[PDB]
């Protein structure tokens, strides 16, 4: 897929949502809450554990897949 994620018809807005979750996880106030609380908050927002794991993975400064979110 890379740039073109096969969604319902167009690209799936999964990446922009994960990007939003990364901003959330990098927030000072948010970082003060227990890990379980941060994950659960993202789950209630509609993200899956797979997407949350990806958000945590990109919340530092890394990119295992050469594309850069």
């Amino acid at each position: 897929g890379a740039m073109a994620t096969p969604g319902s018809e167009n690209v799936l807005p999964r990446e922009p949502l994960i990007a939003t979750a990364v901003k959330f996880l990098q927030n000072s106030r948010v970082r003060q809450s227990p890990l379980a609380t941060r994950r659960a908050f993202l789950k209630k927002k509609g993200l899956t554990d797979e997407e949350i794991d990806m958000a945590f993975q990109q919340s530092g400064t890394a990119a295992d897949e050469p594309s850069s979110l």
Binding site: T20, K23, F24, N27, R29, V30, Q32, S33, P34, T37, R38, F41, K45
Partner: peptide
Amino acid sequence: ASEDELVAEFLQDQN
């Protein structure tokens, strides 16, 4: 909708 309501709900509730 913006994420502000959520973030604020988040740390205010888990404060």
